[model samples]
Target: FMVELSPLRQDFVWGTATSAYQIEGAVADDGRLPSIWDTFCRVPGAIDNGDTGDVACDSYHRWPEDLALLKQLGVDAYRFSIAWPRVIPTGSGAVNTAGLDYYDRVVDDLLAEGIKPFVTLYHWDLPQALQDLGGWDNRDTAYRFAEYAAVVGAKLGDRVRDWVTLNEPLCSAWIGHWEGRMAPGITDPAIAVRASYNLLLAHGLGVAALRDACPEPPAVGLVVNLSGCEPASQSPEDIRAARIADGHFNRWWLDPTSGRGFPADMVETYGVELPERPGDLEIIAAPTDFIGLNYYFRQIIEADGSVPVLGFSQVPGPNAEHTMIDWEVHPAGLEELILRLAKEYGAEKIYVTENGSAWVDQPDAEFAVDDPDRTAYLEEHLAACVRAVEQGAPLAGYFAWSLMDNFEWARGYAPRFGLAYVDYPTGTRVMKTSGKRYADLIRGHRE
Candidate 1:
């Protein structure tokens, strides 16, 4: 019998993650201009509690403090994003010197602290200027994204050794398109499909551009959110529904990137009229160094012809535990997803780039924040990762969804996903009990 322990270390790298717009506040400081998120946050009802990242975490001004916390946490890396608007204000054309300098300082700080900086180029913060040029809906936006990638790669290619081109394209596309839950909220189905194509193109183009720029190039990858989709029952209709749902959600991106152009049935279900274009599949199938899977929960689907390809609506299942984010806690789902990726997509190397839960965290009598649900969520997810590793999934690394709680996109500051508690009102950082536990784990692992 074999069992994976909670605090096992096999020379594995463990760290935490944060995005630019989510943590870095100084929105208008230096030469940085407005991003799509800036405009998105302005729309009425765009965010819960009318909260915005205009001053999130204030990490821009408090980089030193955050860096100190990183050293204290004893993690090997800190995965964060470089704001596109901050780096290239207009998306493509002129370089923002101040924006580049800001990251230069941040990178220098990370290097000095013995912490590896994991750079994510685009984390849903597109330059508003590019959005004005039709954003991902337009095919030309892909070229612009490539040009922007080249610019960033040319600048930081020498320093940063690990690059993630895009973080969670599904959310960037479907959430913005079908759910209307993110920036530049729109709900046109056809436009959503178009955006999906362009987004894939942008990813392929960006990877090629970055590969060309970096000398001792970093391993480039894309972070995608994946969920295990289950059929409602044993009927043929239910099984067909499950396949369609899986194809639309998983295969759409996975197949192409993993060397399969498109799932056969998916293409047929899309009216057998594929988006025919020369060199499209070749680009989409471009080789990637690794795959970043952001697993959350499993989805149960019920057939409904009213919807598009999937023709199903996701229904919640009975679960005893739920994160403050209201997502069901299902560690087995992560293990199942990892195995499926290896079996179906042939993903050679994988990393859990973003995996954590949100909980209602507040200061206790001793002025220390505690969230048992979140703590357990992280522990269980880590155990799932350990299981995947033992099962020979080639798990490379694990980065917790967030290092500190910040503005959670449209949801605002309601959910706290950080090991360290952030007091929104006073802008103070307090280490939570989970933070201490995580630090201890890191220390013990290192020992």
Candidate 2:
């Protein structure tokens, strides 16, 4: 059986998204300093094929062309992030007007085209100077993030109406600190837990900063990467394992942000105190205008007594279809998740902030690609979005994960998730088949 399709709202925001570090290349130009991602790529064994985003898409210089591409895509909005180090070289005191000026031009250019700018303040590219001071694990870092947020929010707040404070705090805290992958790589579970706490506080303060700094009322929100959970078997242990996985993965962040405070069950599961001060929960739960969900696939969980931390493993069955990154291709997860967000977390408005997959794209001599898999991926998942909205989800918008190919973090540039093909060497972007499909959808020619 398939989901019945229907026309989307005429006002639904359609768009494409890209992070600063992932697309912008001039890492040190125009007064920009180092971010944790830059330092992380320097480690001997870090980043696949030792690929650094030193030159990425040269987007810092080629933004005009990228903007033209966005115009061609016919999106109502464009979601891109600002580099923290680029704007505030030292992370806290002082400002980089040159960096701020660069964004000002982009914001104005977007407005000139009648497209709304949805700016994300942080996309996991923390200034390296902050990392020297203990990064997120240090409580002071939260304060520093607020300072940075205010700096940018005030500068572009006149035109930029949508602001996302953080993208995927789980990767920033858990994956980077505990799994020892991504930027600011650390392996201490102790630091990971604290980093997680400080990040929530950072989000709290960042939201307040944006609201206070903006000349106009802005829709401030936080972005979390979420996934559906399915038990590996019918056994109670596996079912309980799935629940615990959901608790940590979904509720741990949702509960606190929605003012429910930290999940008591997860507190016992992690054996860590909330690290919260009296007034902190109020700040952390600061009424957000919306929540952005970055979803890709569901986790099939199994109970594993020997596993550390959450004591569960995400094991996809052998028959599962996979993306190039090995993420399960489960479009229904998106619909299930949006409905769950409404019924469970009280997220009145929601956006698919980032959604797309990396796939093998065979480009011809002109860099034109026949990426039908990517096209199908977008169509199927978008159907799930329609289903969710038709079933009473407050789904507001959808932004494809990336607009063009660029650095993919520790996995480097090997995984191509961009709808627009980018030749790394020449930095020339060519629209893939998925781009045509997306443009068609935006023009009301496709459902």
Candidate 3:
């Protein structure tokens, strides 16, 4: 593990990120309508510890404090999402002025602090009304998402230079539909397959909408959780398992977004008619400015037909360190994945949209959490980014997974994965040691 440091890119960026539903907790306030998360949390055993996002971080009202935290971090940018329900309360009938006003203030303030805002249009918090109308499974939902994007663009797209159409669409489709772990929870692969197609379609249409509505050309891209997959051994079962896992996890979305059609092998593997209408693949292959990859760990594939559709299972990485979430800390996997993506898909520009680790952080007598593991996690993963850039990976920037710990969806708030510690009950925030390290790291990288 001898890693060397190199001079960073001339305009390399470092930032922290958060999603609206995960942090902004004004589900019912200021013309904001309920998202599927609001409805999903009420379902029996949907969320862990029965936790809901009703008042997670209260950032909707306390955004100034969050901005101050960003300023303190010395970050060049702050990546966050706009709640779709907040913008279009009913999904797509009439725009909510009050909801738009909230983001208006955020964008203005972020600019004032010299921190660029990278706005994500969706982060799995679909408006409940849309979910009622088949959600991502419905082809109509893609156009609705495009309309929502246009609305936001007319308001904030001029100032916000970065736009992400969707964050981890696979999770939105697979976890939400097949596994029934997230919002709009349902256990049906048929629904999941349809949702996946619609999501890609939405990203394509949404990208066009943002570019058309923007006063200036903003960088628009899609965010996906693409990770590395390794065969457990040289056995045919393991190698085949790894190939299929890569096809599903990485190539499923990557291929289409990069202008290639679906992986034919996977089409045969899933053995289902996709809800792909004529020209649907064309729309799904719409050009993108960049790809935001959220890399946490690599999977060691083990062939297991016992699993229903996947026909594969994950075994632990050999002698790998794992996080509190049981994710193997494979920084080199990130380096390799980035390189592969650039070489295979010819991705022009890439960003580490989200990378962070969750640890059982404990507060000391001084109310400060000593989290060396998290600091090490940050240092190593960033080293991977640097390595990728050195070897010509087109990696532009990196954003830590979260700014402050909030309602972590189905995982609830049990796992803390924030640069800063959020005192959930009191709405108090403290910059952790890792945050301090990040601040120092950001300062050194300043031009």
Candidate 4:
């Protein structure tokens, strides 16, 4: 395959991302309380093969090794989440010094190695205590999130300058509430709509809290999972289905975050009004410094009367290649989505916060993990990013979906979306061919 390199701004960031719950394993240690995930994993049939993250990559005890891997990868930055329950045990009140100390050490270590830290305040691991109190469905939870954000900001704001308030709130609201596929899972459409509103409210409040708490006032933003949706057929019904899916997946979050308010069509489709009080829309529409976009694949939607609520069903694209996770391989969609977002929503800056594919990889006799599929995936998608930037999208950075193989929620540990191969039994880290290729790409930029 032909690979092309495009010029990027010298200040553009290159990084790898991971969520706290997905990698950090010491679940019951260091004054940490059980998160909603810890509870959800206990339910029968909730996860694949009954696998739990009780002892994931063991990053809690082996962060130095992971840091070393990041250094070897030659990345400019590292994006990782701060576990909420790790800092505030029961959702709020007393502070846990141990949790703060852990992140402080990691941040200092990253800075010492000339790598910047991009911190995400929340990544889906809400304290089980908070869920017990109605989770995001209860409006007060937004205030609680702001309080938590302030605490973290006051502690780490002096060092970390890039902060993401929430990673993929739509997944938390819709996947967790409407689809019941994630933790604190519920199956009510009305509750899902309410949860979505509260999550946005929390993002605004969290941004305000960070601005006030950080002495230097860091760049604050929210990470959203977005994709392009196309009709399965040229028929009017299929076209309408694609539009509705686009409204639900992309506009539902982008419109409000960009100060346009929620998509009108979606509001009527969900058939539930957002629980907006005085000043709610103003706060929810707070301007952000940048927007983090996680793009994996495009959705091909078809009209399905069986599911009238959604008015659409996803169908595989014709002759499309798929990743190990069964997601279609659609590199061109990345450029298309970026251009559309910049043209329609006025994104000041955009970062490909998470873009990578899950490929089944195994070590050879020489102990080297050669994953050509993943390496090619990264190269093609990154090229798409450069194309978007060339077309005036203001694309600023790109961070791979993950740094190493870790627990994938619901699907459990079956999927591997990492550049480094993780040995689950002994927690050994082996850099794959993809990892080496990524490092070479970084080095090539300097040459």
Candidate 5:
């Protein structure tokens, strides 16, 4: 495939990203406390390989090295997340000075390198202390999240201008409650609905807290992993299944954040259509500066009577190719989704905050990394971003899903999705061919 070269603006802000628990190890260091992941990993067969983020990429103490790599890549910014338990061990109590000090140093270093910092407040790491209080299931978690947001806002507001309040609340709520795939796992459908509502409320409270605390207001937004859901066939049952799955998958969170209440069909499916609390919509629809979208694959829905809403399944579809993650490589779906989001949800600005593919990258006898699929994936997705903007999608920036390979959650580290490869045993970081391609893209955009 021939890759086109287009001159993106000099200050277009090309960059890469990583998350706290995903990379920053030293999980127990500096008065930090265990989050749900820490406890979840111990629950018999919860995580594959019994893997945990206990010592992820060891980025907790080695962030400077990572940032140096970011500088070397010639990206304008680094998008990363903060571990709540690390900064506020108890979820809502006294702030951990040591944890805050660590981030302070990180921010200072980024600024010194002329690299702007984009911080995500929560990335599925609910402090275990908070989980004990019912986590997102409890309405109080929203208020507690607000308080924590205020603390961090006051501390880092002066330096970090881009702040994402929550990353993929659907995973935080549904995946944790209904699917029992993530931390604080529970299979109660009712609790899942309530958790979904509270997650939105928490995002509102956090946005408000940041608005009130930061003297110099930062650009605050929410990140959601949006999937394109299509019916598997022309059958009416399949179409209904697609609607329900898309309603639950996308509308569950998108509706409330965009001023509509919960997805009506989804609420009805749960048999709990509670009225929006007074001023709740205002809080839930708290104005955002931009919407961060993380896209990878589309879902093909089929009907199954056994499951809810005639059941919904992700049927594999024909595609250009597949990624190491076993997901279809469909960049057109991404461009379509972007345009749909802007038209339906009213987002003035959109960022491809997390979009990448996992491909089989191997170290040869010379220990050199070879990853051609990932390089092609980035180019395809980047081209899609440009296409989306051209079609009036209000798209602004794009950041790959990860900066380096680390604990890949349930899949372990077998699927590599990073520009830089990490030797988990020795904690060594090696740049791959895709990393060099990204550097060229960054330099090309800069020039």
Candidate 6:
């Protein structure tokens, strides 16, 4: 059964998101240095189709045009990340005025157009220099992250009130280190656990640093990619598997950040420790203004010892609809996850920071990229958001996964998750049907 979406509150924020390395080109321009992704792409078979972000949408050179698109869409805010290497070329020591100046101009322009700037300090693009010094595996990198946060906060704190300290630390720690799927790739499960701990430590340090640097203070939060989990069957093994999967993915981060400390069962189950120094937990449990959640799909798990420490594996539902990425289309999962976070973890304020799907899109004879599938995806998930709000969840806002088509990371350019179509060669932007529908949604809500 489908329920009508209740109107969102008067202050609910509506926006779109993009990452620096994924959208901004000029990798080496204006004092910017190589990030781990830059080095990763160079590996013989790292990215798909030999595609690199060397000139992704050329946003650095064409931000004004992107901003115009945002203005035309009538969104209330824009969520974008800043490149660390662009600010401190070597990751530590010496500030690059040219790099900071570029962002300053961006902030000014966004404000000039009556759009709020929601800034993410780190979005998985660690400076390669930091990786050279042992990356997240080394505790010192946490301190370095704090320094970087302070630098960014001091520069743009006055105008940018919404600050996300880190985006999806789980992916940075697990996928990057353990699975070896992303930059600075390493495939050791034990090291992945250590990296995850340090990443949390960095988030705490980042929050403290932002407090010191931002005179006016800001709404500070950490973004985690969370999902709903269910058993593949009614059997005892499958039910137990679902529990462990939830603990591994959701509670592993949620518990600690919510001040509950690490889940003891998980710690012992994985034979991993937090590598904690005195008061490290205190810092990691520091109070935050909000929790930014990136929900996409739900997981159905069954026990499988062959799948390593967690002892679970994902099994696709037999009759479920899926996206181009082969992820199950489970909009109801968004509402379930939100209510769980609010009720169990006491997340008083929440934001759906990244939510969208990729699908095949083609420009029509009229030059408009019509994406009916993508439009339906957005509408269903957005209505799911409203359902959570009506059910007593504290969801504050929603930001679509991307503002335009850019690099798709390891999968490369094959997947198009943008609301607007980008003609790579000419850099011409065309709004897809989804984009037009989103704009109309915002306008309808505004009126």
Task: Say which candidate scores most in lDDT.
Answer: 4
The reply for model 3, stretches above 4 Å from the true place, is 1-6
User: Which tens-of-lDDT digit does each residue in 240-323 have in candidate 3?
Assistant: 999999998999999888777899988888887898778877778778888998999898998998999889998987755788
Better of 2 and 4 by TM-score: 4
Question: Tens-digit lDDT track for model 4 on 1-447?
Answer: 635554677778889999999999999999999999999899999999998989999999999989988998999999999999999989989989999899999999999999999999989999999999999999988998999999999988999999999999889998999999898879899999999999999999999999999877789999999989899999999999999999988899888878888888999899997899999888988878899999998999999999758989999876467998789898999999899879988888898899998988978754579999999999999899888888989987899878999999999999989899898888888888898899898878756
Compare the candidates by TM-score and give the number of the best one: 4
Clashes of each: 0, 0, 0, 0, 0, 0
lDDT of 2 by residue, 1-447 (tens): 222334577778998999999999999899999999999999988999999989999999999989988998999999999999999998988899888999999999999998899999989999999999989988899999999999898999988989999999989988899888988989877788888999999999999999999989889999999988789999999999999989877888899999998888888888866567889999999999999999998899999988887888989744457898888898889999999998888789999999999999899999999898788889889999998888889999999978998899999999998889999888899989998788877877334
Report the C-alpha displacement of residue 169, candidate 6, in angstroms.
0.8
lDDT for model 5, please. 0.84
**lDDT of residue 252 for candidate 6:** 87
Candidate 4 C-alpha error for residue 356, in Å: 0.5
Put down candidate 5 lDDT per residue, 191-291, tens digits, no spaces.
88788888889899999999888768889999999998899999998999899888887888788899887776887777864534799989999999999
Q: What does candidate 6's lDDT look like per residue over 1-447, in tens digits?
A: 222444689789999999999999899999999999999999878888989999999999999889988987888999999999999888899999999998989999999999999999999899999999999999998999999999999999999899999999988988899889888788988889999999999999999999999867889999999987799999999899999988888888999888899998889878976689999998999889999999888988999989988889999955457888898898989989989989998899999999999998888754589888889889999999998998889888999978999998898888888999888887888888899889988888877
Scored by Cα lDDT, where does model 4 land? 0.91
Clashing pairs in 1: none
Looking at candidate 2, the ten consecutive residues that score lowest on lDDT are 1-10
**Lowest-scoring 10 consecutive residues by lDDT in candidate 1?**
1-10
Model 2 misses residue 247 by how many Å? 1.9
lDDT of each structure?
Answer: 0.82, 0.90, 0.88, 0.91, 0.84, 0.90
lDDT of 1 by residue, 1-447 (tens): 122354344657788899999999999998889988999999999999999999999998887777877877888889999998887898888888988888888888888888888889889998888889888887887888888888888887888888888898888888887678898798766667777788888888889999998765768888888988888888788778877888878888898887777788876766534444799878877788888888888887778788865588777756888777668899999988888877777788888888888887768754588777777777788788878777878777788877887899998988888888877666677777777777877776666
